[PDB]
Write a protein that binds this ligand. Structure first.
Ligand SMILES: [Ca+2]
Ligand SMILES: [Ca+2]
Ligand SMILES: [Ca+2]
Ligand SMILES: [Ca+2]
Ligand SMILES: [Ca+2]
Ligand SMILES: [Cl-]
Lengths: 25, 25, 25, 25
């Protein structure tokens, strides 16, 4: 398990990547 | 909980994102 | 140890970096 | 504490940011 802040940061990072990909596609 | 280094990295990453957004807006 | 979500996010981030470098090279 | 993989990823991310800043400056 991780600090809740780190979990949130990881989810934001993933969604950032996905939104970038979809924008480019 | 997480390694203090990872917590710091996560906070830096978040603030990086926010500053980028505000710059673009 | 970390939340499985955070581990996945970290691996994705690393591979993102590597693919970017290889693209640029 | 965190998974060693996550710690490494966090350090890489930080150094990535620092190198980017120095390049821009
Ligand atoms: Ca905490
Ligand atoms: Ca932990
Ligand atoms: Ca430590
Ligand atoms: Ca969990
Ligand atoms: Ca492990
Ligand atoms: Cl963690």
């Amino acid at each position: 398990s991780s600090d809740p802040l780190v979990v949130a940061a990881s989810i934001i990072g993933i969604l950032h990547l996905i939104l970038w990909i979809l924008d480019r596609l």
